[PDB]
Design a protein around this ligand. Sequence first.
Ligand SMILES: CN1CCC(N(CC(=O)O)c2ccc3cnc(Nc4ccc(-n5ccc(CO)n5)cc4F)cc3n2)CC1
Lengths: 148, 290
Amino acid sequence: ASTSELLRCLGEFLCRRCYRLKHLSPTDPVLWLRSVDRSLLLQGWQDQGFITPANVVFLYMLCRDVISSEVGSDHELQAVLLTCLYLSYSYMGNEISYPLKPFLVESCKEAFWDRCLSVINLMSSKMLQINADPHYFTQVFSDLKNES
Amino acid sequence: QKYEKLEKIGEGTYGTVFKAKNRETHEIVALKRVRLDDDDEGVPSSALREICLLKELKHKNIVRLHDVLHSDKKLTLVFEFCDQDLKKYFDSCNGDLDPEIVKSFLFQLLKGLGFCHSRNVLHRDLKPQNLLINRNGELKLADFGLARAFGIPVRCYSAEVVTLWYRPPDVLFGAKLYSTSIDMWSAGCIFAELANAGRPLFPGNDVDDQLKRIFRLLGTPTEEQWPSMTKLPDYKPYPMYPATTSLVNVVPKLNATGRDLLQNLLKCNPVQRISAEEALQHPYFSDFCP
Ligand SMILES: CN1CCC(N(CC(=O)O)c2ccc3cnc(Nc4ccc(-n5ccc(CO)n5)cc4F)cc3n2)CC1
């Protein structure tokens, strides 16, 4: 039920999913997420940090359906994870708006937005269901904790 | 390429909105153009949320999102096209509506709003400009830029939600959490506009003026009516304004039935605010009603 504890599961989840990445650490996802939450906070784009137990469970719910087993590089995994994050902020974040710079790690911005549209077309329905159905939220909360 | 622009409808922070024609099918749509090339402003953020929500909100009283195009350095949301908003309708008709049009618009608003709430979505930006009106009399709830899904336990939402004139007292008092009750207050404010000269019921300059203008008409709630009021984060003591102030001169288009619905929508204490579901069963909407 701790954020660090739930982030450590997500990282261990991503490492198990992405078999092809041999030199990826379960702390790398955690470092990339915390780094973003800090940046937005210190730039004054939010008053409080976004990364809480509930939102880590939401982010996980996206990652497990968006992130291919066959992602070829750590750089691609970060691009995809941060796209899922940008969508978590935009769906659940208490601020009206969040900027792109913290979330963009690609030289091709066209690629980032095309991917946003891809994930919304796949997940928009479960994005609402995890909020509408408490049973589904607990099912996904459980699954996350069972990823260590 | 796929769409021919005809004329601009409006432009703001949210993006530019054109009337447009499909080049293939010749059908008249509305395009909202959202620029992505400014990488230090979060306008896209809101656009993507609006897309996630409208993809799961199909109902004849909610603006229909047909398609989303990514081309150039722009997002283009393709909406069904509507004739005007309720803001330009009030201007169009000297703010002076037929009691049956008043009744028709509020009905359609509560159907689209009761649909949202049932699908676990808060609108959080009800105002005349977000009510699209067709010539055939159809009304659509539009602009889900500030809308969010609810159900997952949170510390709080944002208090910086709903434009000042349509924001309920609990939120003005800085309420951490609020429910579907938030949209039901805005619905009350819009209903009072329809039922007078299309003029805003509580047009305050700041939060203080807003709460003073509401309590002056409806009366300052007591600890009996609203126990938790005095415990709210931005609570400060207001004058005890009486609960005897007549509503007859404020909404002179409404019979006692209309006025009873209005008072159920505009309860300060969010817990006692009539729901969209409950509102639609109200005598004001019977074929019996005089
Ligand atoms: C403030 N906020 C801005 C965004 C806007 N929006 C995008 C969205 O909902 O996300 C849409 C979406 C679909 C729309 C379909 N139809 C229209 N039609 C129309 C609306 C007004 C006018 N109009 C008012 C005054 C004047 C001056 O004569 N024209 C003329 C017209 F053709 C708008 C839509 N907006 C909703 C409102």
